C-alpha cells in the first residue's frame, strides 16, 4: 500500500512505532487499516509539536498505566478534577488538561463531537484542520500565533503530500 509507505517516509520512526504499537495492541494491522495508521501518526505528531512550546505534559503516546499515573499525579498535586477520559496534554501555565483534535471535516463538526464525548468542561478542546482552520474552548488558542501556524503548516503539508501521491481522497472520506 502507498499509504503505509508514505507514513514511514514522512513521519519519524518513534511516531510510526508508537502508532503501530497502539493499533497492534487492539489487533489492528497498520497494513489493513492504513488510513487509521496515518491519522494516529498525524495526531501524535501534533500533540508532540504542541508540547514543544515545561508548560506542557504529554499524556498522549504513553501506555495506559504510565498515562493514568501521570494524570493521577497532576490531579493530586494541582487539585484539578480527575478527567473521565485520558487527555492529550496538560498546560501548567493555565493549569488545565487539553484535548487536541485533528479533522479532515469542518472544525465545528469535530469540536462539538469531542465536547459531547468529554462533557467535562474542565478539559480544554483544541481542534485543528488540514485547511489551516482551528477551533478552541472559549476561543483561547493557548499557543502563540507562530507556534500554532507551524502545526497548521505541517498539517497542510501532510495533506498535499498525500494528494501528490493521490491518497488524500481516501483519507478525507475516512
Ligand atoms: O486515544 C486517544 O486519546 C485519541 N484517539 C483518536 C482516534 C480515534 C479514532 C481514529 C480512527 N480513524 N479511523 N478509524 N479510527 C483515529 C484516532 C487518531 F486521531 F488517533 F488517529 C483521536 C484523538 O484525538 C485522541 O486523543
Ligand atoms: Mn488522546
Ligand atoms: Mn486527541
Hey, is 158 helix, strand or coil? helix
As for how many domains the chain has, the answer is 1
Contact between residue 89 and residue 47 where contact means Cβ atoms under 8 Å apart: yes
The method of structure determination was X-ray
Retrieve residue 71's grid coordinates: 494524570
Exposed/middle/buried for residue 163 (C-beta within 10 Å: 0-12, 13-18, 19+) = middle
Give the resolution to one decimal, in Å. 2.6
| Grid cell 481542534 in the structure block, residue | 127
Give the other-Cβ count within 10 Å of 13's Cβ: 9
Ligand 1: residue whose CA is nearest its atom 12: 36
Q: What is the CATH number of the domain that holds 152?
A: 3.40.91.90
Q: Which ligand is nearest to the CA of 58?
A: 2
Contact between residue 115 and residue 125 where contact means Cβ atoms under 8 Å apart: yes
Handedness of CA 27, 65, 19, 174 (dihedral sign): positive
5 vs 49, 108, 159, CA distance in Å? Answer: 22, 31, 15
Cβ–ligand 1 distance for 87 under 6 Å, the answer: no
Q: CA 9, CA 129: separation in Å to the nearest integer?
A: 22
Please state the atom number of ligand 1 nearest to the C-alpha of residue 101.
24
Contact between residue 30 and residue 22 where contact means Cβ atoms under 8 Å apart: no
Check whether 52 is labelled as a binding-site residue.
Answer: no
Ligand 1: residue whose CA is nearest its atom 22: 101
| Parent domain of 100 | 2-172
Q: CA 27, CA 15: separation in Å to the nearest integer?
A: 19
Q: CA 134, CA 44: separation in Å to the nearest integer?
A: 17
Q: CA 82, CA 74: separation in Å to the nearest integer?
A: 9
Q: CA 74, CA 120: separation in Å to the nearest integer?
A: 17
Identify the H or E element spanning 133. Answer: none
82 vs 30, 38, 64, 72, 124, CA distance in Å? Answer: 32, 30, 15, 7, 13
Q: Is 114 a catalytic residue?
A: yes
Candidates 96, 86, 93, 83; CA nearest to 137 is 96
Retrieve residue 60's grid coordinates: 498522549
Exposed/middle/buried for residue 90 (C-beta within 10 Å: 0-12, 13-18, 19+) = buried
User: In sequence order, what are the residues at sequence separation of 6 or more whose Cβ sits closer than 8 angstroms to the Cβ of residue 151?
Assistant: 46, 49, 50, 128, 143
Ligand 1: residue whose CA is nearest its atom 11: 36
**For a substitution probing ligand 1, which of 26, 33, 37, 39 has the most ligand atoms within 8 Å of its CB?**
39
Hey, is 167 helix, strand or coil? coil
Q: Where are the alpha helices (DSSP H) in the chain?
A: 2-10, 13-25, 34-51, 64-78, 107-117, 145-164, 168-172
Q: CA 154, CA 158: separation in Å to the nearest integer?
A: 6
Could you list which residues have their CB under 5 Å from ion ligand 3?
A: 88, 100
Amino acid at each position: 500500500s502507498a499509504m503505509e509507505d508514505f507514513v514511514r517516509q514522512c513521519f519519524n520512526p518513534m511516531i510510526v512505532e508508537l502508532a503501530e504499537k497502539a493499533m497492534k495492541k487492539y489487533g489492528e494491522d497498520p497494513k489493513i487499516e492504513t488510513n487509521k495508521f496515518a491519522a494516529i501518526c498525524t495526531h501524535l505528531e501534533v500533540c508532540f509539536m504542541y508540547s514543544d512550546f515545561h508548560r506542557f505534559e504529554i499524556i498522549e503516546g504513553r501506555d495506559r498505566i504510565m498515562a493514568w499515573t501521570v494524570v493521577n499525579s497532576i490531579c493530586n498535586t494541582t487539585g484539578v478534577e480527575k478527567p473521565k477520559f485520558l487527555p492529550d496534554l496538560y498546560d501548567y501555565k493555565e493549569n488545565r488538561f487539553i484535548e487536541i483534535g485533528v479533522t479532515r471535516r469542518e472544525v465545528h463538526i469535530y469540536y462539538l463531537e469531542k465536547a459531547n464525548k468529554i462533557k467535562s468542561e474542565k478539559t480544554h478542546i483544541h481542534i485543528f484542520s488540514f485547511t489551516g482552520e482551528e477551533m478552541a474552548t472559549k476561543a483561547d488558542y493557548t499557543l502563540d500565533e507562530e507556534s500554532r501556524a507551524r502545526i497548521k503548516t505541517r498539517l497542510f503539508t501532510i495533506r498535499q503530500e498525500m494528494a501528490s501521491r493521490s491518497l488524500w481522497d481516501s483519507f478525507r472520506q475516512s
